[PDB]
Amino acid sequence: YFKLKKLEKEYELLTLQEDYIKDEQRHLKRELKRAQEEV
Amino acid sequence: DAFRLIDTGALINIQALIHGLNRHYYSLNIDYHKTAKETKMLMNLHYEEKEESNLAATKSMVKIAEQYSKRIEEEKELTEEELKTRVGRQDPKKHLSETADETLENNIVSVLTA
Amino acid sequence: TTAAPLLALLRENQDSVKTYALESINNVVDQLWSEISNELPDIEALYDDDTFSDREMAALIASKVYYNLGEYESAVKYALAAKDRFDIDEKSQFVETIVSKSIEMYVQEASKQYTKDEQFYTKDIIDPKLTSIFERMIEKCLKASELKLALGIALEGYRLDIIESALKSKLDQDSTSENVKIINYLLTLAITTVTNSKFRSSILRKSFDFLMNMPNCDYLTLNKVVVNLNDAGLALQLFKKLKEENDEGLSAQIAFDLVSSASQQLLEILVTELTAQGYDPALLNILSGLPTCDYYNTFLLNNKNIDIGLLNKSKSSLDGKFSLFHTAVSVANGFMHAGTTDNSFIKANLPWLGKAQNWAKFTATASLGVIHKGNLLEGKKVMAPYLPGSRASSRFIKGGSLYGLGLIYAGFGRDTTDYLKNIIVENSGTSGDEDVDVLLHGASLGIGLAAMGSANIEVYEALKEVLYNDSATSGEAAALGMGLCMLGTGKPEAIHDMFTYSQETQHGNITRGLAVGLALINYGRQELADDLITKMLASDESLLRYGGAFTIALAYAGTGNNSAVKRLLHVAVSDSNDDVRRAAVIALGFVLLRDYTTVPRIVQLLSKSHNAHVRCGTAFALGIACAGKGLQSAIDVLDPLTKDPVDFVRQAAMIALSMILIQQTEKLNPQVADINKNFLSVITNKHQEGLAKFGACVAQGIMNAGGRNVTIQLENADTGTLDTKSVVGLVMFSQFWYWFPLAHFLSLSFTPTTVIGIRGSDQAIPKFQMNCYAKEDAFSYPRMKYSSKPYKVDNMTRILPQQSRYISFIKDDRFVPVRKFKGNNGVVVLRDREPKEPVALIETVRQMKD
Amino acid sequence: MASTAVMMDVDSSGVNDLHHSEKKYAEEDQVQELLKVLNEISKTTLTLDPRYIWRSLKDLSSLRNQELLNAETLCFKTIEVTAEINCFMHLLVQLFLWDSKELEQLVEFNRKVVIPNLLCYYNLRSLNLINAKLWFYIYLSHETLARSSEEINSDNQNIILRSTMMKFLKIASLKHDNETKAMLINLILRDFLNNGEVDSASDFISKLEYPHTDVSSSLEARYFFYLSKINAIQLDYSTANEYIIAAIRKAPHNSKSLGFLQQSNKLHCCIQLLMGDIPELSFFHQSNMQKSLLPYYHLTKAVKLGDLKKFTSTITKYKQLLLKDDTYQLCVRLRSNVIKTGIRIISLTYKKISLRDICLKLNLDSEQTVEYMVSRAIRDGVIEAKINHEDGFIETTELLNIYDSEDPQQVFDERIKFANQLHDEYLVSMRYPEDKKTQ
């Protein structure tokens, strides 16, 4: 049970950690293309 | 660009006018604005598409023999190309994919209308 | 053996047999369920035979098969069906499994139950079997008697019945300090965790109540708790209980818990309350906090470490960009003088003023209130020669005092403010002189400055005309102060207005600052502004999208809303306009405040990007998140950005670093030397811009703000709590190369490192160096580990939030705190145990005038 | 000497410490790689003898000394923990008939290793430090019984084992409690392949495949191997072969190619037989019989003609070898299946033949069973023809298509399903190089 509420809970972050990225993923993806234009 | 060469002081530049002799490029700072209105219509550039697309470019089966032959010619180009695998180039790996891959979409959609 | 007979015995009659089938089966299920897995259809029907009693055998048997089939809500259900065949103390991994399996089900159920009702758990809707077994394990958790074990469950279990009893029972049990701490352990946790604050807010009240049981509980706990609840009654209950418990230091320290935490809006309730409650005026006098301003200034005036020579070297480095560089150094001087009240360089170059420009002339006047910030009398007289009616050389200089005034008086200048607002209101419906408009604007600036957080419709209103008066000069400030006034949940009508005026009013800036005001009066509203957020998001115009993030920030700042962040990201991801993204990136570190942690890892993407603005917006938020914190790790990410070809980028990076780097310097952080010199390097460099040197000189002056002896603090673990005023200067400074005469707002988060005796009484200021060794960073700082050993010198100066807490008091002197070195330099207050005796007497400029 | 032996173990423990740090990606694969090196030094001599001292002193270490049972002595709570387990791992490892003969000593010790302070807390911790093969591989030997009487009641230890393996199937929590798992099944599978009907294989199938990645392709293939033989008398052939076609190279075995992959191949040969395909044994001539194919060749040799007599004779001769491999049950079907195969080429070529020529081939075989025998044939398709005895004319269809059907394009979706094949699995292997650059 115990130390996880301490520990385990801190992994919700690591969930978001993914969730930070695939967002930013499309960024570079698009940031590519409109930039892929001018180059 | 836009020049207008002189200032009040500045955004307030300040000296060269009061100290005289202002000769410079001196841009202003550009922007512009329109709307989503035209934007949509502007994105409307590219009856219409139905007349214009599938079905207008159903023109595909006519040349299948060439569409073969194209692919058939895609063939030879490659062992040749691959061969070099054994800088300067005509790269062994390059066109190979590129060569065929284009066809695919039309090669694909050839089906669709039915 | 193999189940074929038991497979056969199944359909065979004589429920006796079926029992002995099931019996024998049950024992050998474990292996042979595999064969038996095909008999489950009958077994199902078997569990549907009330005729055959034991079928709970088969049910749990099926549950055995179902784990062995990976079926669980199946298994659980039939284990639930068992109740007899099943027991918790029955030990198999399976049993342990199915239980743990069965358990989790409860949580979302309970949470879904929690969704609608928060007394859901008081009711039947969850299968009680689980709930029982749940609580039975919670009982076992109680018998485990490590209760976060139980709590974090009941945390999600949302069962205060469990929780409170678990506390209350344990309360009388043992752990005098722990039963307090166990709460805090969970309470501090609860703050970090619970989605619905109500469940947590429920904790907070009971927590207080648990603590209000009081074998003298820790109040700053309750303070923050209260400050988290902002429930005056509790504090008032405290105050009574306080007055019941009354001791100066107790009250004082409580009021010191209070003066450092409760919002300008919240606390003033308690003021009139405490007024109405009867009181000790010391409390009302602590409500000043001017003692701090004094002490801070006292600290400053004493402990200011200046070296304007290098700033002179930075100022003598150039006057250039006409103003726009000369502009900056008009500020860093203010930093080193912030609250310090000195004109040093101001006198040095009087031709400075010549080299100032109407706005810089304006700004140079606004450069004062910084310098004098915390002089709650002089500053007006300081501004007096430059006040309106004292004339000026420039109307903007004349306008400058107006804004410059409130800098000291923010929240305390309302009278003069409203007074000046009268001058505003005077010129509000008229007077389109730019000179006036500044005199309007500079006033339109300083108005909401002091009016910030205080709800005054006039502030909103009077500006709303000055706003609607459509002076890009003037109307801008309105778009701020109006936000500042109603900064809070504000009102959606102004929002409509603003948002209307946004789309309505035609201007870049006037339209711009609106969303900022929108960002303001949407503060902590979170879910609320999402509409306008969505509206702002849906805006064609950057500006609404722009402030949307800031709106989203002030809503969700501090605690990360992933979705918000996720939005903000994707927004920054999905917007053409870079500044928005830049902004959107910037505002992240607000909703990303509470964890600076991943922010480097966060920006480590945006660190690396084609675009400067992206790479620009990076610098701030991270530079913001760790501003009051560490992570050269975080820092070092930006040093490449400090070399990003755009000076404006590195300029930001310059800033961003120093925002972190104050007090952190000198082989604690060796890098500061370069970073400093980099400025100087740049400051030396002619091929570096007045972008570059700007931030450089400023970021220098940043590090040197408040005689370099002061810090930058937000959501201060000192209070554990936010202060919006800390934020403001940032968001204010946000648009600066946009609108330059701003950053002086940044004076807000300036924070004392002061360590000064004070008293648990009216203060003889006995100053002692309490001497507990830190690895010594009062030795690590600009020129011009814990060894539990006596530290050299503990009185004021550098300290550190940490180097605070490697230092503990001597009990030997007359005065001792109850909170036993509460641990926060700025809060000081050695509590007074032995007055009118030795531990002598020490005074200050307060003691002089105040 | 014993040193260098232990020095390996030391270095292993050194890498076990790399597990005592964390997974064990190395350590396991190290242990794996070490398990390869397990052959080299070996003995027990002062290996096990100082091992006690090297272990000294833990109780189970002294318990394992019961397995040592020798003259060791000499001299030499934390560093001794999973090492001892890892040595208990080696304790297993020790016993391969390496450093052992009768593991029935160790059988008990297996349990008395596995059960005590083991088979307990390991869920994610011990990462297939269990080798249940090595567990059972012991009993695998013992299952040379015969002898044990079974033994017991029948044979409950192996029963209990299945249950004990079940006790891991229990412990298989899908928390990554996996790798070893379907060996336990592979066991039970081959335990069905001892006496049993796998069909709870379907229930085994119901759970999972050995998911997924971290398992040795071997067992993953050895999964399929048995998983084939499911479909064997489940009478799915393709999928069975598809398992073989998921099995063979593919789990690289070369050492295990010799005895073991023949078995694999032995079954593989049977498949196309079940499908009547008879691929070219031209290679299957070699690395084969010797000890595997050639009866299948003899079968194929028959199955090319499918002359029942001549066919049967093969079986009649190789039945015991069939029997040895329990491939006997097969091929009885394929008897007329080739006779029917020939039927197709008897000249179904003519759009008929008359009854009694297509009877003639059966008038070469039997009569008016023809009616059946052709209906017996026409039944399954396997030929497309028609008849009516009213006509007494056995009418053999076109079998002719201008295809222009999806038929090849099915075979493209096949290809297409590989259009990603590594094309995707590159992106799979794009991470490893570049994200280990990030470390």
Q: What is the DSSP letter of C34?
A: H
Calculated CA dihedral for residues C599, C603, C605, C607, nearest 10 degrees: -150
Note the residue count of chain B.
Answer: 114
- Beginning with the edge strand found earlier in the chain, give each strand of the sheet holding D385-388 in spatial order: D353-354, D393-396, D385-388
Q: Comparing C-alpha atoms, which of C453, C484, C481, C479 is closest to residue C467?
A: C479
- CA atoms of D189 and D197, how far apart (whole Å): 9
What are the Cα distances from residue C483, in Å, to C543, C551, D47?
15, 11, 80
Residue C711: which H helix or E strand, with range? strand C710-712
Q: C433: helix, coil or strand?
A: coil
**B7 φ, ψ (degrees, to nearest 5):** -140, 175
Residue C455 CB contacts under 8 Å (≥ 6 apart), including other chains? C265, C485, C486, C488
Hey, is B73 helix, strand or coil?
helix
DSSP string, C53-83: GGGHHHHHHHHHHHHHTT--HHHHHHHHHHS
3-state DSSP call for residue C177?
A: helix
Amino acid at D321: L
Radius of gyration of chain D, Cα coordinates, nearest whole angstrom: 28
Contacts of C323 in chain B (CB under 8 A): 9-10, 12, 14
Q: Is the peptide bond before B55 cis (omega within 30 degrees of 0)?
A: yes
Given a contact cutoff of 8 angstroms between Cβ atoms, the answer to whether C369 and C338 are in contact is: no
Q: Which of C131, C64, C58 is nearest to C93 (CA)?
A: C64
Strand partners, B9: none
Q: Judge residue C116's burial from the number of C-beta atoms within 10 Å of its C-beta, 0-12 exposed, 13-18 middle, 19 or more buried.
A: exposed
Rg of chain A (C-alpha set): 17
Name D430's Cβ contacts closer than 8 Å, sequence gap at least 6.
none
How many angstroms separate the CA atoms of D143 and D159, rounded? 12
Task: Using the Cα atoms of residue D257, residue D260, residue D266 and residue D272 in order, give the sign of their dihedral.
Answer: negative
At position B92, the amino acid (one-letter code) is: P
Q: Considering only CB atoms, which chain D residues are within 8 Å of C34?
A: 166, 188, 200, 203-204
Q: Does C293 touch chain A (CB under 8 A)?
A: no
**Which residues does C3 contact at the CB level (< 8 Å), separation at least 6?**
C25, C28, C32, C35, C36, C39
What would the 3-class secondary structure string for chain D be?
CHHHHHHHHHHHHHHHHHHHHCCCHHHHHHHHHHHHHCCCCCCCHHHHHHHHHHHCCCHHHHHHHHHHCCCCCCCCCCCCHHHHHHHHHHHHHHCCECECCCCHHHHHHHHHHHCCCCCCCCCCCCCCCCCHHHHHHHHHHHCCCCCCCCCCCCCHHHHHHHHHHHHHHHHCCCCCCCCCHHHHHHHHHHHHHHHCCCCHHHHHHHHCCCCCCCCCHHHHHHHHHHHHHHHHHCCCCHHHHHHHCCCCCCCCCCHHHHHHHHHHHHHHHHHHHHCCCCCCHHHHCCCCCCCCCCHHHHHHHHHHHCCHHHHHHHHHHHHHHHHHHCCCCCCCCHHHHHHHHHHHHCCCCCCCEEHHHHHHHHHCCCCCHHHHHHHHHHHCCCCCEEEECCCCEEEECCCCCCCCCCHHHHHHHHHHHHHCHHHHHHHHHHHHHHHHHHC
- In the chain, the amino acid numbered C641 is L
> B34 CA to chain C: closest CA distance, Å?
10
Q: Which residues in B31-45 are b (16+ Cβ under 10 Å) and which e?
A: eeeeeeeeeeeeeee
H helices of C213-307, in order, are: 219-229, 232-245, 248-259, 264-277, 281-286, 290-303
Cα–Cα distance for residue pair B103/C541, rounded to 1 Å: 42
Residue type, D157: Q
Instruction: Report d(CA D203, CA D221) in Å as an integer.
Output: 19
**Which distant-in-sequence residues (6+ apart) come within 8 Å of C707 by Cβ?**
C300, C303, C304, C305, C306, C336, C340
Q: Write phi, then psi, for D262 (nearest 5 degrees).
A: -50, -55
CA atoms within 13 A on the CB side of C434: 7
Contact C676, C654 (CB under 8 A): no
- What the block records as the tokens of C735 is 């648009």
**d(Cα C351, Cα C356) in Å, to the nearest integer?**
8
Chain C nearest-CA distance from D171, in A, is 7
Q: Is residue B78 within 8 Å of residue B96, measured between CB atoms? A: yes
Residue C400, SS3 per DSSP: helix
Residue C721, SS3?
strand
Which residues, in sequence order, are bridge partners of residue C716?
C721
Residue D54 and residue D38: Cα distance in Å, rounded?
Answer: 18
Structure tokens at D278: 């008879």
**Nearest alpha carbon to residue D126 among D74, D70, D83:** D83
Instruction: Report the SS3 class of residue C48.
Output: coil
Chain C residues 57-86 with a CB less than 8 Å from chain D? 67-70
Are the beta carbons of B11 and C359 separated by less than 8 Å?
yes
Residues contacting C630, CB < 8 A, separation 6+ = C660, C664
What is the rounded distance in angstroms from the CA atom of residue C717 to the CA atom of residue A17?
25
D166–C35 CB contact, under 8 Å:
no
Give the Cβ contact number of residue C161 at 10 Å: 15
CA distance B97 to chain C (A): 29
Chain C partners of A31 at a C-beta cutoff of 8 Å? 609-611, 614
d(CA B44, CA B50) in angstroms, rounded, equals 15
Q: Chain C contact for D166, CB < 8 A?
A: yes
Tally Cβ neighbours within 10 Å of residue D371.
15
Size (chain A), residues: 39
Q: Which residue has the tokens 């000081």?
A: C828
Separation CA C326–CA C315 (nearest Å): 8
SS (H, E, C) C752-785: ECCCCCCCCCCCCCCCCCCCCCCCCCCCCCCCCC
Tokens (6 digits) for D206: 């119901």
d(C-alpha C245, C-alpha C241), whole Å:
6
Cβ–Cβ under 8 Å, residues C449 and C407: yes
**Residues C289 and C261: beta-carbon distance below 8 Å:** no
What's the one-letter identity of residue D324? K
Q: Which amino acid is at C395?
A: R
The pairing of beta strand C750-752 with beta strand C710-712: antiparallel
CA angle (B3, B8, B11) in 5-degree steps: 80
What is the Cα–Cα distance from C311 to C309, expressed in whole angstroms?
A: 5
Contacts of residue C55, defined as CB under 8 A and 6 or more positions apart, other chains included, come to C22, C46, C47, C48, C49, C81
Residue C138 DSSP label: H
Q: Helices H, strands E: what count in chain C? A: 43, 2
- HEC readout, C197-235: HHHHHHHHHHHHHHHHCCCCCCHHHHHHHHHHHCCHHHH
Q: Which residues contact C480 (CB under 8 A, 6 or more apart)?
A: C445, C448, C513, C516, C517, C520, C732
Sign of CA dihedral D233, D237, D243, D244: positive
Number of neighbouring beta carbons within 10 Å of residue D17: 14
With an 8 Å Cβ cutoff, are C324 and B35 in contact? no
- Chain C residues in contact with D162 by the CB 8 A cut-off are 31
CA C417, C419, C420, C426 dihedral sign is positive
For residue C525, CA distances in Å to C488, C491, C508 come to 8, 11, 27
Q: Residue C560 — φ and ψ, nearest 5°? A: -65, 120
Is the link from the previous residue into C35 a cis peptide, with omega within 30 of 0? no
The secondary structure element, H or E, covering residue C750 is: strand C750-752
Are D346 and D353 in contact, with CB atoms under 8 Å apart? Answer: yes
Q: How far is CA C484 from the centre of its chain?
A: 18
Q: Which residues of B touch C (CB under 8 A)?
A: 9-15, 35-36
Instruction: Write the CB contacts of C847 (distance below 8 Å, at least 6 apart in sequence).
Output: C765
Look at residues C133, C49, C56 and name the one whose alpha carbon lies nearest to residue C98: C133
Structure tokens at C384: 């007096």
Residue of C745, C327, C372 lying closest to C386 (CA atoms): C372
Other Cβ atoms within 10 Å of D91 Cβ, number: 25
In degrees and rounded to multiples of 5, residue D154 shows phi and psi of 150, 105
CA of C155 vs chain A CAs: smallest distance (Å)? 9
Sequence letter at residue C172:
D
**Is-contact D206 C33, C-beta < 8 A?**
no
Q: Sort residue C337 into left (φ over 0), alpha (ψ -120 to 50) or beta.
A: alpha
C and A touch per CB criterion (3+ pairs under 8 A): yes
Give the span between the Cα atoms of A24 and A32, in whole angstroms: 12
**Degrees (nearest 5) of the Cα angle D430, D436, D437?**
95
Q: Yes or no: say if C111 and C99 are a contact pair by the CB < 8 Å rule.
A: no
- Residue C337 DSSP one-character state: T
Tokens of D180: 């070893």
| CB-based contact C323:C331 (threshold 8 Å) | no
Residues C30 and D159: their CA atoms lie apart, in Å, by 11
Nearest CB partner across the interface for C30, out of D154, D166, D196:
D166
Task: Give the number of other Cβ atoms within 10 Å of residue D344's Cβ.
Answer: 17
DSSP-assigned letter for residue C747:
G
- Interface-testing mutation among C353, C357, C512, with chain B (most B C-beta atoms within 10 A): C357
Judge contact between C182 and A34, C-beta under 8 A.
no
For residues D34 and C438, give the distance between their C-alpha atoms in angstroms, rounded to a whole number: 81
Q: Are the C-beta atoms of C455 and C485 separated by less than 8 Å?
A: yes
DSSP, res C89: S
Is the Cβ–Cβ distance between C241 and C825 less than 8 Å? Answer: no
Determine whether the interchain pair D169/C97 forms a contact, defined as Cβ–Cβ distance below 8 Å.
no
The structure's method of determination equals cryo-EM
Beta bridge partners of D99: D97
C826 within 8 A of C753, measured Cβ to Cβ: yes
For residue C28, the distance in angstroms to the closest alpha carbon of chain D comes to 8
> Residue D359's Cα: distance from chain center in Å?
45
Asked if residue C293 lies in contact with residue C339, where contact means CB atoms within 8 angstroms, the answer is: yes
Position C449, amino acid: L
Query: 3-class SS at B27?
Result: strand
The CA distances from residue A35 to A30, C647, D121, in Å, are 8, 22, 54
| The two three-digit tokens of residue C532, written as one number | 């306008």
User: 3-class SS at C598?
Assistant: coil
CA–CA min distance C562, chain A (Å): 7
Q: Are the beta carbons of C622 and C605 closer than 8 angstroms?
A: no
In a mutational test of the C interface, the residue from D164, D170, D435 whose CB has the highest number of chain C CBs within 10 Å is D170
For residues C591 and C557, the answer to whether their CB atoms sit within 8 Å is yes
